[PDB]
């Protein structure tokens with residue numbers, strides 16, 4: 001895989017796995033606030049996914065915690081993904097540039 | 100409203116430990132040292148200057164205040 | 178590192194970037210009908226028109242003047258056919274004006290090549306519009322955009 | 328298909344479509360390869376010959392001609408059968424039996440493509 | 456023999472080091488100073504051994520000047536925090552005096568000092584393996600005992616005479 | 624060219640050396656992803672699905688003491704639910720994750736090419752020393768069959784509410 005004309009890029013999915021875990025394991029930190037229920041961010045997202053799969057065709061109504069939980073979780077996940085790819089490719093084992 | 104406990108041995112211990120932790124860390128993390136003497140210490144603490152001491156104690160006070168308030172919030176300190 | 182001169186030519190009005198010169202980009206562009214190798218200009222036009230006349234029926238079907246009527250789908254197909262004819266006319270006039278009669282062996286940049294391309298595009302577009310019309314008229318999920326499952 | 332709804336018990340036609348559609352997507356890849364010239368597969372060759380009737384090339388040719396001829400005949404015949412059934416509500420063997428069929432026409436449910444019989448009565452004669 | 460046989464051997468580690476089983480699956484020794492890691496391991500093990508003993512013995516004997524909590528672990532919160540901060544300061548004095556002021560990775564092992572060697576006694580390889588194995592076991596056991604006392608809210612020996620489930 | 628599909632051409636990525644390689648890849652996921660990564664994923668699925676199918680059948684036959692009291696007669700995914708509250712599934716998840724950390728390291732090695740996919744060196748009884756190729760082919764075959772088997776068991780349970788063997792006993 002070439003990220004550009006002649007520049008190669010590893011595209012390791014283990015980076016994706018590690019970033020996902022790095023954001024999700026902290027997300028387990030529970031909160032008693034109504035949005036999370038009693039649970040953490042990742043667990044609340046799983047619970048909402050199941051709850052709104054039970055009612056499949058109908059979308060989670062505006063004001064449901066699902067949208068806020070989804071947005072926050074994916075914001076953090078994408079941030080961790082960017083940081084993880086930066087670390088693996090610039091600070092990793094085969095980087096050339098001193099970053 | 101959160102709980103902020105009154106001064107106690109626990110608060111003093113938290114503050115002292117935060118200051119000591121930040122002093123040691125400042126030994127490891129402060130890149131440039133100023134130009135002057137050093138407080139009278141040998142070994143690892145052989146370039147500890149007064150400005151570095153003051154900076155580490157300032158950060159230690161910030162961290163101690165934060166930890167005290169947060170532990171009172173979660174109820175652990177109080 | 179990732180952005181470089183185009184074709185190692187620093188003075189051409191282009192830059193080699195991930196969007197412009199990545200492996201995925203090159204594979205996708207080289208496998209699209211406009212660039213795939215071996216296709217005749219007619220087959221390129223066939224595939225492209227098939228793909229385009231399909232999406233055309235929907236906007237007309239679901240937002241046209243007769244969209245709240247019982248003839249919405251037929252009206253939509255008809256309006257797609259009209260637009261396809263107009264665009265085929267555009268293609269034909271562009272071909273006759275731009276390409277002179279010299280023979281470059283059907284390279285899609287020739288009079289004959291562009292004539293074949295426009296003929297194939299017309300046929301494929303009308304066929305794709307008709308296929309979309311059939312599928313919409315026969316499948317409820319497409320007539321309701323999924324609001325049959327509600 | 329009327330019984331194969333979301334709140335339905337049977338899935339006959341959907342099962343048939345599922346399996347034949349797997350077969351058909353694989354055959355689509357095969358015919359793409361044949362069309363591009365990358366593959367040496369010949370038209371209609373799926374490698375299905377358990378009894379080895381067409382192993383011999385001359386036998387393969389005679390059998391290919393027989394298959395295409397009978398396929399054309401069946402293509403005509405099945406269309407005839409379907410249209411006879413739409414007109415008279417009769418299967419092939421019945422329609423064969425009754426000749427003045429339009430006298431003994433049997434009832435038949437709607438096709439599922441009702442508009443295609445629009446002109447049968449207004450424009451066309453409706454001898455029934 | 457290698458602890459994890461489906462993973463590349465750790466090159467930094469060696470048999471000469473006490474308690475070498477080839478167990479660096481995640482490659483900490485490749486990213487950090489191995490002398491630092493060894494010294495930290497020995498110190499953590501020593502503190503954890505003393506901590507297991509200090510979690511078990513208070514259940515039986517309580518000092519006169521102090522009041523015992525439900526568990527020895529809770530006694531930490533019950534006792535004056537002046538005591539805890541003074542323990543911290545005494546440990547700091549001990550660290551400074553032991554390391555002769557050489558408390559930082561860049562200077563800690565200067566003078567060709569074996570990790571964990573404070574000059575208290577001579578170093579024997581078998582005794583060192585004993586020490587490190589006991590320290591690792593005591594680290595894990597301190598984790599277990601501390602969490603048992605934390606959750607159960609009962610002393611360890613009482614909880615071994617009862618064996619209630621740990622639930623939260 | 625492909626043995627599995629006589630009329631389709633052999634997949635380019637599949638060399639035919641790998642266990643269970645009969646040139647079955649009509650859609651072309653081999654080109655999309657590294658073949659070693661896909662092989663590791665396939666073997667992981669094989670093993671977890673084998674355990675899941677054997678567990679479904681064995682849970683139908685017998686239930687460990689005390690687990691029946693906690694579960695309250697629930698079966699298959701219902702049992703999962705009942706036990707999530709207890710934290711049993713929590714222990715299973717924690718320890719499987721702990722194993723999967725070293726699995727992640729092993730997959731780093733595999734993608735680097737140092738390790739063969741699915742090779743954890745776990746042969747305590749040495750049953751695979753004699754005929755490794757035959758054992759690997761058996762693993763892949765039984766794993767595919769067990770993936771489809773657990774799929775069938777779970778979906779029959781979703782349909783009827785019965786268990787793998789209970790449905791066979793009565794419909």
Ligand code: CLA
Pocket residue numbers: 101161162163164165166167168169170172173
């Ligand atoms: C073990 C010690 C300890 C403990 C137990 C706690 C515990 C706590 N701290 Mg913390 N704290 C500590 C140490 C500790 N602290 C230390 C050492 C410091 C010094 C640095 C602080 C400084 C600190 C501050 C300054 C504050 C807390 C607060 C809190 C409490 C609420 C935080 C919360 O849930 O916000 C959750 C909040 C969010 C998830 C929302 C954050 C979004 C903000 C509003 C905007 C940020 C957006 C940013 C600009 C853009 C994003 C980045 C971009 C690059 C994408 C929480 C009980 C807060 C508090 O007391 O509130 C009542 C508080 O304000 N702490």
Ligand code: KC2
Pocket residue numbers: 535537538539541542543544545546
């Ligand atoms: C790490 C070990 C350690 C060392 C090396 C050490 C050295 C010295 C020195 C040497 C220069 C002096 C002069 C001194 C003096 C006092 N120590 Mg101290 N001390 C250590 C440990 C503890 C603990 C655990 C406690 C404690 C206490 C007191 C009290 C309080 C008396 C009171 O109750 O009024 C006084 C006056 C107790 C306390 O603060 O109780 C509220 C208490 O529990 N100390 N201590």
Ligand SMILES: CC1=C(C#C/C(C)=C/C=C/C(C)=C/C=C/C=C(C)/C=C/C=C(\C)C#CC2=C(C)C[C@@H](O)CC2(C)C)C(C)(C)C[C@H](O)C1
Pocket residue numbers: 375376377378379380397398400401403404405406407408411418419420422423
């Ligand atoms: C390939 C293969 C194998 C195979 C095989 C198989 C399974 C082969 C199957 C072959 C079949 C099923 C052939 C069927 C042909 C039917 C025709 C020509 C029908 C014509 C109907 C007409 C004209 C009509 C009509 C009519 C009309 C219009 C209206 C009606 O009212 C009246 C009427 C009926 C007259 C085997 C197993 C040997 C193994 C080998 O190794 C591989």
Ligand SMILES: CC1=C(C#C/C(C)=C/C=C/C(C)=C/C=C/C=C(C)/C=C/C=C(\C)C#CC2=C(C)C[C@@H](O)CC2(C)C)C(C)(C)C[C@H](O)C1
Pocket residue numbers: 673674676677745746747748749750751765766768769771772773774775776779786787788790791
């Ligand atoms: C690693 C290793 C070792 C090992 C090991 C181990 C523990 C190996 C374990 C292997 C296992 C558990 C293999 C399980 C295979 C299960 C299959 C194929 C299930 C098929 C189900 C089907 C077809 C079905 C079905 C069904 C469906 C769909 C619907 C139902 O209504 C009906 C029905 C039930 C019929 C040991 C410890 C020996 C050491 C050694 O040194 C190496």
Ligand SMILES: CC1=C(C#C/C(C)=C/C=C/C(C)=C/C=C/C=C(C)/C=C/C=C(C)/C=C/C2=C(C)CCCC2(C)C)C(C)(C)C[C@H](O)C1
Pocket residue numbers: 402403405406407409438439440
């Ligand atoms: C299942 C289903 C349905 C269905 C259906 C089906 C299966 C419908 C099938 C329809 C078919 C097979 C129609 C065939 C028509 C063939 C014709 C007109 C041939 C003319 C040949 C000629 C003129 C040959 C001439 C010949 C030539 C060329 C050359 C010289 C010789 C000569 C004899 C002259 C529906 C529609 C009811 C809908 C329902 O919801 C679902």
Ligand SMILES: CC1=CCCC(C)(C)[C@H]1/C=C/C(C)=C/C=C/C(C)=C/C=C/C=C(C)/C=C/C=C(C)/C=C/C1=C(C)CCCC1(C)C
Pocket residue numbers: 227228229231232300301302303304305307308
């Ligand atoms: C870029 C991106 C990001 C997020 C994901 C996402 C998937 C949305 C993706 C975008 C995807 C897009 C833009 C997909 C659009 C797909 C389109 C327009 C597909 C069109 C398909 C066309 C089809 C079948 C046409 C079928 C036509 C047929 C038989 C015609 C047959 C016929 C012909 C040609 C002539 C004679 C008559 C007859 C026989 C009927």
Ligand SMILES: CC1=CCCC(C)(C)[C@H]1/C=C/C(C)=C/C=C/C(C)=C/C=C/C=C(C)/C=C/C=C(C)/C=C/C1=C(C)CCCC1(C)C
Pocket residue numbers: 531594595597598599601721
């Ligand atoms: C109460 C109090 C008072 C004053 C100080 C402070 C405020 C900090 C506070 C003190 C807090 C303390 C002492 C906290 C210490 C926590 C500890 C020691 C926690 C320990 C956790 C242990 C854990 C996870 C162990 C997990 C180990 C695992 C899986 C091992 C796995 C395995 C490995 C590695 C190899 C062999 C096979 C096996 C067994 C599968």
